[PDB]
Amino acid sequence: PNPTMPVKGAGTTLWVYKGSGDPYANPLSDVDWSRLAKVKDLTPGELTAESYDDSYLDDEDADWTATGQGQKSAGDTSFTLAWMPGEQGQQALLAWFNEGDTRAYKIRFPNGTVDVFRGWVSSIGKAVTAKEVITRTVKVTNVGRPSMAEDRS
Amino acid sequence: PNPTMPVKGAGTTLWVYKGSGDPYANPLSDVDWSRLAKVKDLTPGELTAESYDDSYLDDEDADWTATGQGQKSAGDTSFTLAWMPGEQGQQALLAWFNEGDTRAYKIRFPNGTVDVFRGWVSSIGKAVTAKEVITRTVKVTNVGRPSMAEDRS
Amino acid sequence: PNPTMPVKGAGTTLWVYKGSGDPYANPLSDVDWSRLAKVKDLTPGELTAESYDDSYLDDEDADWTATGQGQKSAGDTSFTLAWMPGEQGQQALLAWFNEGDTRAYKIRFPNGTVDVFRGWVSSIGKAVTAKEVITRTVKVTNVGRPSMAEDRS
Amino acid sequence: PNPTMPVKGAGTTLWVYKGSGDPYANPLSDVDWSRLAKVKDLTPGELTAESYDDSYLDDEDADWTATGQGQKSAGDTSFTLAWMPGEQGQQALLAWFNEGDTRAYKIRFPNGTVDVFRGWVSSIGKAVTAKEVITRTVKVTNVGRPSMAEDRS
Amino acid sequence: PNPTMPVKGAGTTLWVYKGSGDPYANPLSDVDWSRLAKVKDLTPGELTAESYDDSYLDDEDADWTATGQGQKSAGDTSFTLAWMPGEQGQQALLAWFNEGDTRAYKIRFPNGTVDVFRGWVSSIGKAVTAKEVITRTVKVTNVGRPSMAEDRS
Amino acid sequence: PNPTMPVKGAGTTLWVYKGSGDPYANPLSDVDWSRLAKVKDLTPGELTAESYDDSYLDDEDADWTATGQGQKSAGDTSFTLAWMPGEQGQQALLAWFNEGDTRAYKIRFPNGTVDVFRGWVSSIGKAVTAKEVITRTVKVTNVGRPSMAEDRS
Amino acid sequence: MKTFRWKVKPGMDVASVPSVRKVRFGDGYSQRAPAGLNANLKTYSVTLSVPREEATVLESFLEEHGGWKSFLWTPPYEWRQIKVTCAKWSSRVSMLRVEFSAEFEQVVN
Amino acid sequence: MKTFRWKVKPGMDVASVPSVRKVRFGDGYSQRAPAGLNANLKTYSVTLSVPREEATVLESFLEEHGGWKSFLWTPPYEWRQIKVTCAKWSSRVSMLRVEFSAEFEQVVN
Amino acid sequence: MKTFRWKVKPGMDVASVPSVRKVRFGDGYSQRAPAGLNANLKTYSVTLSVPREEATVLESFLEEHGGWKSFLWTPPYEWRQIKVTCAKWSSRVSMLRVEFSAEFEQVVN
Amino acid sequence: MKTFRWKVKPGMDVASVPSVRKVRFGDGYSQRAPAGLNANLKTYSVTLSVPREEATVLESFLEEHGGWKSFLWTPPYEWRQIKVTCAKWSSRVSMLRVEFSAEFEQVVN
Amino acid sequence: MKTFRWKVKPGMDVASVPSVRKVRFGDGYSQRAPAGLNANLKTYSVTLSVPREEATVLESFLEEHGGWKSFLWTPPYEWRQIKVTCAKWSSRVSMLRVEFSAEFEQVVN
Amino acid sequence: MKTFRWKVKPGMDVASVPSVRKVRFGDGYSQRAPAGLNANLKTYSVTLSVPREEATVLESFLEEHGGWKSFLWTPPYEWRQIKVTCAKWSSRVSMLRVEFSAEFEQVVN
């Protein structure tokens, strides 16, 4: 577990907060965090930002256009996991979807770093095939400001 | 039949309600449910939702955007089953299409749970191939509130 | 020839009505029906319908959207057949295209069932290749009400 | 040379009219017709038509839509022939492009039938490859009424 | 070097005019022409033309639409060549780009024919790969009237 | 190290300026330049320009369109480097993203020349795979006038 | 009285403005009462699409009546025969079809 | 009085403008006071869609009231029964359904 | 009188409005009658495009007549020769073609 | 006096039209001078989005004041508390949310 | 008299409204006759695009004449030199180019 | 006098209309003369965007002058200092930046 060296993705886990307090403070403790098990694929959201135009008439170098950073935004998070409706985690997931609310979900990595977001559930799907496990596909739209793993170092 | 463990897709059956009463109450009984036979493919609809804007001026953190869940909606259900015009199920399907109506249809899984929806028929197509069986392609548009498998546990 | 059993597509034929009367009545008789021969591929049209919105303010369950069936419509029928300008059928096809008119065309299946539509010709094309038979591609836009095989059963 | 039997595309030749008179009358004579040489590809235009709406309120069957044929139109004819600027045909082709003009061109088939169109030149391109012959890609947009092979029989 | 026979593309070269006068007159002399060396791929622009409409009410044959050639235009020329920043040609290319100007560039073919255009530089890019030569990609937007090889024959 | 001869892409390094002064003056010194480590991919932005219409009525040659260069602009620069949150470079990268700011970044090549740009960060993303290294995908949008390799020669 | 046998196209617009006598000063007490017996007379906005050849017959039918004479017509909206008058109509001639726009006003006489 | 039973599509516009007496003095000072004893009255603007067969019933209902009689209706905005009068209305007749647009003003009478 | 030779591009708008004398009585009854002895006169609105070289001929032809002289023209709408007069016109000069827009009133003179 | 606690949404428009006295005949010499002390009073065009349940409270707050009474509000544009009056407001009811549009005019008294 | 040497952009609009005397009461007999010798005077709506540096020269040329003085200009429409006056012009400044819009009116004097 | 410092975004509109005294005689002849001794005065229309924190400074600067005092400013159009006055202005407050709209009339005073 060396943060300063490349690591493989195997061992990543997904967690859901089910407590009261501030998830951003001490997210390294699993107390008051549930877990979604048997995740097949995970695609974390990409943080983006839009642009405002900053070109004026009074400036001299008008040949080349210029711009500047606008209001940032965090993208959507999608993951596919095995369909086990009898498990507590997926029932909590459906309750999360039905009662539209923003709840914090944590991502843990093989090295000792975690990633915390806040978002509501935007999509739930299913895929049925004769020779494969039934899969539950979920997409979560993040809201607010994330807590990247680089903050705590 | 363990709901808490992953299952394979083989064995899924499709049913159409042909009675009077509440489809959502006791959908585990096959009485008053017809059966569509020999389904080659099945694509359940994906539950989605739209996003309203939750950004104000009076707040302090203006760097990152905010939003929230809006009015949810159920998706479109598609399946392809073999063309058997002499069977009762497909005659019921054509009567369902021609008479604009919304009726409940059940999806049964290898594990002991079912999925119940409600929607009208939006499309019917056919596929003719020289060396393959003629198939009937049906698209059903869901209306209202679904009754997922997680509700009854 | 068992309508209640799956069938392969081999043996499908295409016919064009060239008489006076009601094609929908007794379409099982080939009298007053011409034939288009040597068809390479056949893609029957898909019957569709558009959706209106049925959500109100007075209802209680405002979380999920609702809708309903609108005006149905029949899609386009496309087939590709070998190019023989000397045959009567293709000359009748060209006369059909030039004189914009709605004429009934019948599709016959290996099992004892037929499908009758009505439409004008919307496209005629050709493909020339050095080592393949010259092909004539036709697309017909259906108009009105079709007569599917499930009606007569 | 049997029109009533399928033929292979090999042997198709392209001709350009360079005379005075009626192109459509006796197009089976090669007098006053030039020839483009060594055509690699040939894609004849597809005759099409637009649809006007034929739905009224006074009719009884409002469940299904209705329509009808409108203005027909001939498509675009494109071919790729080898690059030979010293030949008379390609010089005539460039003069055809530079001078905005509509001229008739004949497509001859292995069976004893010809196809005559009328259109101007809409595009001219070139392709240079290290190990392949330089090709001249030409696109022609038809104007007016074509004269297919089924007319003369 | 026979213009009247097909030729392979190998041997094509690219030249840039660096003198004062009329490039279109005697373009077969390399005096006052620089050269861009080690070209990997070359895609000469395609000459195009737009269409107006020529259908009136007073004419009789209203079934088929008609049109006519509009204002011609020459497309964009793109080529990819090896990145050699120390060479004079690529420095001339960047001076061409920064000082937005229209300059004539000549294409020479294995047969004794040349193609002369006029255009400004519209794009300059780069592609870096670990196991391949660094490549400089250029796109030039032609302006005015070209001088095709068919003119001088 | 021959600028006049083609070179292979292996050995390219990426640097970020962290000093006070003029980045464009003497960019061949590594003092006050940080180094982002283990870059898997790199896609430099493509310099482009927009076209204004130079067509008038008074001119004689109206057959062909005319245009000219307008405002130039530098593109977006994309790279993907191995995920190492403990390294100084990636912490600087996240600080660069979070604080809306335009900073100069240098691209060094196997031959003795450099490329210098100036822009803000427009996107940050992550990719997690079971059997591959976690990577950090960054997109930087250039602002102003770039300083290519051709300038200092 | 001649009859109108042509067929209208989707989108026919029925505008009704009942005639009423109301007196109200400022925001005060308000009184309302009908103006007469046949207070509500609807005006139908119709659109017709007919080929090039058939345009002359429709144009002659509308021109012969003028704005004064009234003909019988049964609207698709309520299916009850009424007497209407067409005071203005506009044609938009195309290559193969002609599109008509007109306003039919219900009349008592 | 009869009650309005049919339902309203989303997009209802509620416009409420009070009436006041304003006097503007020299340097931005002013006098403001309500015009009348009674509270202001809103003007709900509604749109609704009904099938072809049920359009005649609603049209007859709005017709018998004219523009002078008031009927009870419970707006979804506040869910309290009020008295409204429809002075004018229009309908667009499609192939399957008819869409009504009307303005229900509120009256205390 | 000279004849108009050039052809008209599709989209011609034929607007006809008759002139009537209306009196509106109490209970919806009324009096209607034509205003003049002669039949109404249409107002064809046309659009036509000609090459740059031929634009001068059409402009001179419309200029010589001013806004007071009338010329014969056979509209495609009914295919019968009539007398029309063009009070005003406009043109938009492109690179290759000039597009005229004018309104041909019909006069019996 | 009451205070406004709801939060406005992006797009608030602040219009300023200072009151000034100017005399100018034709193009001649022009003289300008202020009209009074509180010459510049801004009107704020706000837009508010609230759920279905909380629309009643905001509507009641805007209604009980009428056009006359004034309340305290701290605009997000300059962050200085001022006294405004809401003379007119309009609501657009949706399935889950209600959208308010109003104009707040600053006042001295 | 100075001349205009700049080149106009595609889309010139030439508007011609001949001056005529017409008398017509109601729908009766109509009489028309020209008002004078130079009845038809066209106004050319031109559009010019010039770089930043050359905007000052064109602006000065249009400013020194004012609305009164007349200059010679050879329109691309008919290629005959005429005397025109520019009474109004608006400039839309961009980053590298300036776009002019003006109306030139033909005059006799 | 204070000088305007903030910069203007592309799209500035410069509108100049001179004042003339025109008389139109019989056959197209006329009399034209300038109305006044002084040259005409342009009216620049500008649009500029500044961050939220700097918006207060610009708003206070424009409010200080009211609509009667003039400030020096050098338009990008011609690069010569002139005297301008802003009679009215508006601003649209977004999340991060405020965008102003104003028209700077040119005054010789």
Author numbering:
A (entry chain T), B (entry chain R), C (entry chain L), D (entry chain W), E (entry chain V), F (entry chain U): 4 to 156
G (entry chain E), H (entry chain C), I (entry chain H), J (entry chain F), K (entry chain O), L (entry chain D): 1 to 109
From the paper:
The temperate phage lambda, which infects the bacterium Escherichia coli, belongs to Siphoviridae. The virion of the lambda phage comprises an icosahedral head and a long flexible tail. The tail, which comprises the tail tube and tail tip, connects with the head through the neck. The neck–tail complex comprises a channel formed by stacked 12-fold and hexameric rings and a 3-fold symmetrical tip.
Our structure revealed that the tip is similar to an inverted cone of 410 Å in length. We resolved all 109 residues of the distal tail protein gpM, which has 2 conformers with minor differences in the E-loop. Six copies of the 2 gpM conformers form a 3-fold gpM ring, which anchors the tail tip to the hexameric tail tube through the β-sandwich domain via electrostatic interactions. The protein gpL contains an N-terminal gpVN-like β-sandwich domain (residues 1–166), which corresponds to the HDI domain of phage T5 pb3. Three copies of the gpL HDI domains and 3 copies of gpJ HDII domains form the last ring of the tail. The E-loops of the 6 gpM molecules exhibit 2 conformations to adapt to the 3-fold symmetry of the last tail ring. In our gpL structure, an additional density feature in the iron-binding domain, which was surrounded by 4 cysteine residues (Cys173, Cys182, Cys205, and Cys212) and could not be assigned to any main chain or side chain, could be modeled as the iron–sulfur cluster. By contrast, in the lambda tail tip, the 3 copies of the 2 FNIIIs from 3 copies of gpJ form a closed cone-like distal end of the tail tube. The density in the tail tip lumen was modeled as a trimer of the gpI (residues 135–223) and a three-helix coiled coil belonging to gpH (residues 818–842). The gpI trimer serves as a plug to prevent the early release of the gpH oligomer and DNA from the tail tube.
